[PDB]
Amino acid sequence: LKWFNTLSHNRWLEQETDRIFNFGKNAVVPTGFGWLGNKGQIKEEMGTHLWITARMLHVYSVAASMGRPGAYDLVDHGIKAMNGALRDKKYGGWYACVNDQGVVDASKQGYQHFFALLGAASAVTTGHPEARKLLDYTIEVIEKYFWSEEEQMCLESWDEAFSQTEDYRGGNANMHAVEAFLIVYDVTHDKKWLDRALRIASVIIHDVARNGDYRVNEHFDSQWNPIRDYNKDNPAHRFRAYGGTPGHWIEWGRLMLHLHAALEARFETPPAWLLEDAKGLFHATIRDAWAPDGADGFVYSVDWDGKPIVRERVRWPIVEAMGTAYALYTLTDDSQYEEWYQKWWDYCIKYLMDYENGSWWQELDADNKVTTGKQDIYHLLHCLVIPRLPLAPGLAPAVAAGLLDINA
């Protein structure tokens, strides 16, 4: 019944957190962080990705501030890799993927860059001597090719040379921008980062999503008009999945509570829609995606009527669900959020956690059985560490500030 803000529960979280930090260290390769498989081994053919490398940089900055030996070393390894092979020393920014043999993907993807921004901002909290310089440059690359001052939104991607930008606008790239902007804000207080976050949110969530029963529209045209039918011919395709992706909805919910908390931290009454929409997104994720087909677990994608499409149970959606449950609980003090949190934890240790091979499974059947791959651990901190910290400042900043278990 009572788990939040209790030391007994938090100790359990910390212990699982260590099991996860330990699992991730096996990803260290020369050009950064490799792709970990079902037993924690590296999948060379996957090479070294930008998004995975930036996330880890962020992940071990948190671990370093938690006083773990070797984490800081991984942070140094992350900074050097962001100044290495992955960095396009010719056109700027970072390549999408590279291996020891050279570049595998030279495309410049927005979401992957905002993750670079997050990594840098979090790396700054560790005080690493090269971190602040990495963030400065990253902020430059962002403002030069990913943040549109005319649209006041984020772009999707570009070719290596940054010659032509894709005629597509997405909710995922802008969501990770809001995520990164929050931390850049915490380590700069340059007002623009927060306003830009609130701006991205008022558009994709308070405007579009909210008028559609809180089902986030992911695809927009270059003029920022919803492209509802996008990918309607490739329904099961995960990448840019047709319809709405509920996991994203709930993640968006939390981010807005962090926006809410940031404003409150500076004695500023936050706009009421942040909390309203956060709940809206939270309830809509449970309404359409939680156990809608005869079994527990969150389905991956849903159509515009609330009906499931991809019913596989992928790991991160429920992980984000827990993080959001905690955020809502923190601002509402409403027990229903803690009940969902506890319920989701029971599900996780029942079907997702793998104590035999390490970490948690990537995804399961619509019947929650293992069937395809665990290259990420970054999301896990949102249900393992976030519940031990206030909502402001952000994740890394708060740990670095010694706020862990502050409310317990």
Added chain:
Amino acid sequence: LKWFNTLSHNRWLEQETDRIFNFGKNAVVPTGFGWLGNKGQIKEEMGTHLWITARMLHVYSVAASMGRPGAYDLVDHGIKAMNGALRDKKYGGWYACVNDQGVVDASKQGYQHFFALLGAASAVTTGHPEARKLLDYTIEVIEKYFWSEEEQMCLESWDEAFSQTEDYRGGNANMHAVEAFLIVYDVTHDKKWLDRALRIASVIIHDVARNGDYRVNEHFDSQWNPIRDYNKDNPAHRFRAYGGTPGHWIEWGRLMLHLHAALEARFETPPAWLLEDAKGLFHATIRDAWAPDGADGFVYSVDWDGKPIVRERVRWPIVEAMGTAYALYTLTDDSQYEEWYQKWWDYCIKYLMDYENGSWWQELDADNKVTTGKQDIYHLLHCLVIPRLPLAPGLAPAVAAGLLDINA
């Protein structure tokens, strides 16, 4: 020996704080806050000053967050005043002094308007519904008439209608700008107010002061050139007194350590000179001003050779010295600072504190005897509340944030 961060000492501090909060409540007048005498009674002839009203608003905002019944009411009263008689509903800003019958001094003085800015920013920490609006307005007045974007420094004064500004630039008005700016920053988290703080300081302190044996130059010309000879003719005129007034020097010291803390708070390695010049100003104050004439206490004014001019022991100087002692202790951990703090407290209860008539005496003999008036209580928080709080965020913000005694 050990007082800082001890609950026993802090309880003592809190109890005297209440004695003083109580003393000040009697200043309440229809147009704002009156001028209190040696027995806690209002001196009607003095009328209602803008600087006293603004300071009192600041003061009770702190008391309000400390949970003192009545305080919030006085805050409301202060905001009503800042919106009423004191305000120039024609040219903007506030009149220097007014009364029940009309305006007494329509001039618009910088330092007084900066206290207006501090008062509104502090009031914002109480959450009073009319506070934020008051601050925004004050921000307008300040950026239009007192903060010079071209000079990148603060002006001194304007006539009522703001037709022409005074061909003078003073360290005091700009010092209270830094003071107010730090709080505005705490309740807006906007980078500029802090950038403006450092700027003001790099000039008046790191440039001029540091090159003048840390004796702060007070009077300047419209081109910010030091007018060392200012008032060398006129007598011991307190108003823009000739030479250097040490109390201000030690005050600048603390202000820069608050600036230091703010930068550290947002994970930014602060300039090494904030702390260097802090120590410098501290030492210089003791050097020329502490017991230089056969008796304990701080002299009021000193000349460019460091020789006392006005030898009267005014209250606020030693009060600020204590505050600065605490700040330097917090950032250096050097025991000499704590020794001075205790040394100064003993002096205060022995010669300044008036348990008989209330509050503290405002000024003493060169021999520490009461002679020729207790209109302020704002300074006292610097030696009664600041020692119970971290250096970041500022006074009012920290109390409202529940940081009182956090380090004890």
Added chain:
Amino acid sequence: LKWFNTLSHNRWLEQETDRIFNFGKNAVVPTGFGWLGNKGQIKEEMGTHLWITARMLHVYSVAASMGRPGAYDLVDHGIKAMNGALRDKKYGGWYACVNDQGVVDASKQGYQHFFALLGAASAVTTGHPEARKLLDYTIEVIEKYFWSEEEQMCLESWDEAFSQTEDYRGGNANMHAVEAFLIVYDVTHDKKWLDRALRIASVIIHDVARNGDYRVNEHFDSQWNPIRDYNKDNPAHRFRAYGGTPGHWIEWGRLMLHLHAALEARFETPPAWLLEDAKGLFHATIRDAWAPDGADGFVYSVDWDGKPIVRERVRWPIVEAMGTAYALYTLTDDSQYEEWYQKWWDYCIKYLMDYENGSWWQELDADNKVTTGKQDIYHLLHCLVIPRLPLAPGLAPAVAAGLLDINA
């Protein structure tokens, strides 16, 4: 903004509490506790009432557990008084009032007898060797003559010989029954006391009061039919005042939250009507009684249309209101409650608290000006100690359990 559960605010409350404990100790007389006046002097003309003596036994039982010397002495004195002259050693129970010259009022009043029960129960929390025996006896009297087993409610009063009970039924006697039952429950855990309390509440509040816009109906005939007309022609009369007396409404609200908490404390989900009706009574009190006539303060009585009658501002109503704000804040975390709490504290120090003569003024005219009796300090604990403790166990029990400031 934030006072509840903050050590700074609670320190203020404690210090005021000590000022009140000191004031009431001047009421000690040979037969029990006297009636204190405006300067804290005994008004021996008033004699020694049963209710005042029972209340003081309760008050100093709290003071005693708070570690105040002398307090226990008053508790001992209170018990001896309950076993002495005040006790009807012929027919049982206690006279309504006596003096050094004999019995002044031999009537057996219910509410006073229930206060006797509260007194005995609280005294038991001190461990005084004679308290338990006093409570056991008090139980007999109560179950024998004041808790109608047939009516499942409380009787009003009896003649000295308990031969005929009054043909009237009131809310006040039954409300103080609830108040006392909660504590007996805390010191016995005999299910009946809590059940009886719920029963009383369900009838007077959930059934009657709730159907009449949460305006509590005080007068009933022996068949428990409300006598809405009762005392009509005598409006200004306060004994069994005509219409509704809001002060009682809000008090019932708190008591019901204590029942709520009592049930949660034994891992039982409480019925929702408790919290629902508490909010109803609270809002109902603000609606009709708070500043309804162009001046702050709670009116004493109101009619069935919510229109005022006795517009004097009596002390206990706003004191109880504050206690209820705290109880409701504690169960909903809704800040509106804390705001009222602070607003009322500012009102109390501005017009009620008397630092010059001691304690608080007991009454003000409709314009909040002091009229001219300062007996009772019992109510004050509800706004001074209650806010520093959980809602379960009850007041005296909680302090004896060492829970003072447990949530701060």
Added chain:
Amino acid sequence: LKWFNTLSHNRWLEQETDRIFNFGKNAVVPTGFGWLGNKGQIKEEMGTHLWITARMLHVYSVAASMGRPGAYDLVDHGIKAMNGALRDKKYGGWYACVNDQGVVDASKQGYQHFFALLGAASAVTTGHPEARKLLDYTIEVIEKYFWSEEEQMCLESWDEAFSQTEDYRGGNANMHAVEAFLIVYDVTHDKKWLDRALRIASVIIHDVARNGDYRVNEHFDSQWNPIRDYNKDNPAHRFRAYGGTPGHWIEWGRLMLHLHAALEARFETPPAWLLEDAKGLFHATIRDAWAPDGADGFVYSVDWDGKPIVRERVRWPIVEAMGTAYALYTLTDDSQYEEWYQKWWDYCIKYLMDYENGSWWQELDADNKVTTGKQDIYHLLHCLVIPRLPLAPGLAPAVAAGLLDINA
């Protein structure tokens, strides 16, 4: 029932402590500390006593460590006095009493010299730059004239020139020696001080008082043989009163518990008899001296059969009893000691504490009415501060070490 180690009780103790510190402040005279009267006025005819000056030095060293401004100044004043007129700069040691004109009593009294030792040892805990030098000189005087290496006990007194020691031996001088030795041990860790303490206690308490039903024999001859009849011709006379002085008995009790604690603090199992005899003395004190004549309170002197002689209730005996009660509770956790403590506090606030004129009354008649006088406050710390500290290290050392309320 529960006061020991509760913050509520300890806050009460501290507040009363401040009321007492303030009182003693007026004793400051050019030669040290004067003799305070019933209104806190200096009774000039009494002059400046060594024992009073030494005690006050000890007292304000505690106050200084508690963070009280002005206290350290008094410590400084005390040290200068111990190096001024009171000090026999010709023969060594200190005159018993002096005034502004000269030496009033040149005798070298042992109990007063041990208070000098206590005062210095306590002053050392404040860090005062002259404290150590004072302690070292005091130690030299002690070993030179008051600690008999041949007798392995303390001497009584000498003439001004230290050429003729008194042909008498007393327990009071040896008892204060133990009290001082404990603190010297705390600020030096030279085993000899604690070993001498044990030796003194083993002889006077364990080898003599214990065989006398725990009635401490105070008068001995030079061969340390008891002089039971000492002054049988003038019982009523205070100085070296006939028979036993119970206040001393219970005080020896506490001192042996601090000794017990000191041994525990160095991981050494303390002899069983220290605790056994402490219980012994405490019991005997209640037996013969507590309310044995029809009214509460402790009588001053007792006959060898346990019969009262001097029945006036002096202040310190009960003050010390409370301290010992705390010490025995701490080592036995037996509630009976806490009950006595509370009972005695009730007695104190009722008969001894004087809130009207200041401090506490020094003496009351057999019926507990103020008689005839407030020259001491040193004993009061034993019931006001001792209870907030562990038994090791001693009073001044523990406060200086930041142990106030450590167990609360």
Added chain:
Amino acid sequence: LKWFNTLSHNRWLEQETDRIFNFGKNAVVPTGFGWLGNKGQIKEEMGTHLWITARMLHVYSVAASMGRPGAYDLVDHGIKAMNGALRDKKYGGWYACVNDQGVVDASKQGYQHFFALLGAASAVTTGHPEARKLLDYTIEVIEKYFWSEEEQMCLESWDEAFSQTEDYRGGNANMHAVEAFLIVYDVTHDKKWLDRALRIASVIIHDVARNGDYRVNEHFDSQWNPIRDYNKDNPAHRFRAYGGTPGHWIEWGRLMLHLHAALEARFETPPAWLLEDAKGLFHATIRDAWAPDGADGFVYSVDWDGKPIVRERVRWPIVEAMGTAYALYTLTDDSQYEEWYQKWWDYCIKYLMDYENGSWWQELDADNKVTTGKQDIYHLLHCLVIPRLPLAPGLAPAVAAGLLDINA
């Protein structure tokens, strides 16, 4: 960035500590504690060493105070061994090494005897019934054969029958004398041991080392004259290595700060050279031994110009360095010290820590690679437990006093 005094870091340290305690329990052999191998197995051929046995007694006294089941049993085993086969029941003291068949090495080694003194003093903190007896006897052996009252320094060794002492004096034997003396002082509170410690250090460090650029000279002739060339014929032989061994330098640093803390605790201002030289020894160790040959880590020995000799990276040197970093940080609050600590922890988990086979590796190449014995864990408490305790009292005493994590 921030690890010291953070619960999150200390939890990491406690958990590794348990892993370490678990590894050492396997060393139990009938005659005391055996020599453990790289897989935690007993190397029977090495037999039972006095130094190892004494170190484990010490180690498990700490584990026992930390509440670990089994620990106290190992403490008991340790005491039995020190009273058994190891003890020379004919000439006194202990044999340097023995096995089940008899005595392997009958020489009486000073540094091993001082470890016996440390083990006994540490054992005393557990309260074991036979500890004090062992400590008492060890004291007698030490004062009779290893502490020279004429030299005011420690002797090196003797033959079995104690007929002739070695014509040599070493800094190592005297260093562990200071280490043991500190703990003897904590369990005897006899300044004699702290005086002897302060004396040892004033000679070995403030005298010699400080004048040789803080390069500690360890080989001396019987007249205490440095033997700079000692073992130049065996420049790669770790035993009494030629030149300087930095590991020892930094260790002396920490020891002197414990000595500093010890003096502070008894309110005695400590000699400034303790902290000054500690800083000096710290800097010297980094200057000459940290990464001086193209790879991270500390070299084992260095010549008189600071040039490396033995370049293998032995375990204990860096472990001691982290301990000293903590102590310096604790007394200077200077960030560089924490940065080194963190930097060194990252190195340890990277190359030294062996989760695969248990404990940590004992030695590495100049390239930090493992090669061709894990007989110790005593050193590990200096980087695992010391950072969770204050500097006074010492390690075992402080844990037994409940100070673990007191500053976090």
